[PDB]
Amino acid sequence: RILGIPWGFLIGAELTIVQSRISLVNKIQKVYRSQGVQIHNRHIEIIVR
């Protein structure tokens, strides 16, 4: 309702996807770090991609 053609969908998708990736990685790493399991964010970011 704010932006026009290929800007409403383009920018809206970027905001949703960036927000989703940040929360997905945090949620996954919250489980393993509470159990003392150390995994580099590289591996989780590959799955979340």
Partner: peptide, 15 residues
């Protein structure tokens, strides 16, 4: 008024 294709207008509203 329609503004389809006017990138400068949408850049101003994005800011």
């Amino acid at each position: 008024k329609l503004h389809e294709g006017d990138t400068e207008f949408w850049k101003r509203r994005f800011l």
